[PDB]
Amino acid sequence: APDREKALELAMAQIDKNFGKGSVMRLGEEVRQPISVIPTGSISLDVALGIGGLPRGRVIEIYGPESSGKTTVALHAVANAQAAGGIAAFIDAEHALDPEYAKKLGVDTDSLLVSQPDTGEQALEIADMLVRSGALDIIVIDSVAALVPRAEIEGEMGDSHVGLQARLMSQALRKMTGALNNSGTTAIFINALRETTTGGKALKFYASVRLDVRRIETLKDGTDAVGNRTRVKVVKNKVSPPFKQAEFDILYGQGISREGSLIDMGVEHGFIRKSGSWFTYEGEQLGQGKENARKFLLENTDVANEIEKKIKEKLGIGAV
Numbered sequence: 654a655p656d657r658e659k660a661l662e663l664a665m666a667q668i669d670k671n672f673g674k675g676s677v678m679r680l681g682e683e684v685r686q687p688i689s690v691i692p693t694g695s696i697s698l699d700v701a702l703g704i705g706g707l708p709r710g711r712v713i714e715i716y717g718p719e720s721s722g723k724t725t726v727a728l729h730a731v732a733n734a735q736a737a738g739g740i741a742a743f744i745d746a747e748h749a750l751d752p753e754y755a756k757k758l759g760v761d762t763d764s765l766l767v768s769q770p771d772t773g774e775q776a777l778e779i780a781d782m783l784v785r786s787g788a789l790d791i792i793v794i795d796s797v798a799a800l801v802p803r804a805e806i807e808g809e810m811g812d813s814h815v816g817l818q819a820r821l822m823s824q825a826l827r828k829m830t831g832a833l834n835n836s837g838t839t840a841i842f843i844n845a846l847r848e849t850t851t852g853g854k855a856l857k858f859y860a861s862v863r864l865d866v867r868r869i870e871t872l873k874d875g876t877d878a879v880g881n882r883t884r885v886k887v888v889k890n891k892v893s894p895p896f897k898q899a900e901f902d903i904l905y906g907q908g909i910s911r912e913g914s915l916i917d918m919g920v921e922h923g924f925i926r927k928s929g930s931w932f933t934y935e936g937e938q939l940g941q942g943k944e945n946a947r948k949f950l951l952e953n954t955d956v957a958n959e960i961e962k963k964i965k966e967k968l969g970i971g972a973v
């Protein structure tokens with residue numbers, strides 16, 4: 654009478670119908686639900702996400718050590734959303750944003766809404782009023798940790814002191830997430846690990862996607878400062894199989910290196926060969942050293958585009 658596989662499908666099906674698609678999924682599964690996304694500005698990461706970008710209408714958490722590249726990703730997403738004629742908001746509670754760097758990543762700063770809330774309640778509230786207006790594509794909340802409650806900001810006593818920031822962060826998410834769905838606005842919460850920073854407790858359960866951004870190498874190329882190599886881990890992903898990993902280089906002054914990506918992604922995926930030290934493509938000499946090679950692809954843009962193309966084919970191409 655029992656047939657495991659059939660029995661398992663009928664179960665999973667009900668799991669998803671009861672809790673939403675993605676509630677349960679085989680890891681090796683290959684998803685064919687092309688959702689609307691905002692390219693992360695990181696091809697590898699886009700593929701690692703399984704849907705080629707951050708899903709629209711969801712809460713995304715990008716936590717990690719300082720300098721690890723979080724903000725760069727967030728901003729890159731913001732640019733990608735604007736390019737697609739999307740409106741982006743930035744709830745700043747750290748006062749660290751460098752608009753000049755943001756322009757380099759490609760963001761249209763002049764059209765970017767910016768707010769600097771008085772208290773955490775205000776911040777989330779403001780961001781919430783924005784979201785449910787339907788005009789936004791993406792909204793960014795800089796520093797989960799800086800969402801300090803009003804009662805703490807205003808001189809309040811050491812009594813009645815409670816994990817209010819968590820509650821604040823919990824209550825706030827409860828109502829915004831639904832609004833985000835209706836509006837289809839991606840919500841990135843930058844969490845800078847120094848509960849995952851008190852309020853990160855709730856976010857963990859509300860986030861549809863969670864990215865563990867981490868600094869792993871100091872791009873040297875040769876013996877000198879250029880940038881840093883980041884490593885993101887999709888620890889949570891309610892819209893594709895989770896736990897995938899991506900890596901990319903972020904050069905100083907510049908954002909995520911496209912060419913860097915390509916050379917990387919081209920290699921593992923065969924198209925480009927590293928005979929050992931030297932890099933080559935379709936028998937074309939590229940250069941000794943990821944950098945000489947990187948440079949190559951920046952100069953000879955005719956290559957690189959056919960490569961990005963070859964890679965965009967073997968992986969994520971037009972669907973349905």
Ligand SMILES: Nc1ncnc2c1ncn2[C@H]1C[C@H](O)[C@@H](COP(=O)(O)OP(=O)(O)OP(=O)(O)O)O1
Nearest residue numbers: 718719720721722723724725751754845881905906
């Ligand atoms: N103002 C800037 N000028 C040049 N390079 C920058 C600047 N800001 C960021 N970068 C580049 C080089 C850094 O190694 C890399 C990481 O910075 P950021 O992208 O700000 O890291 P982060 O997102 O992990 O830290 P955090 O989110 O806690 O502020 O980004």
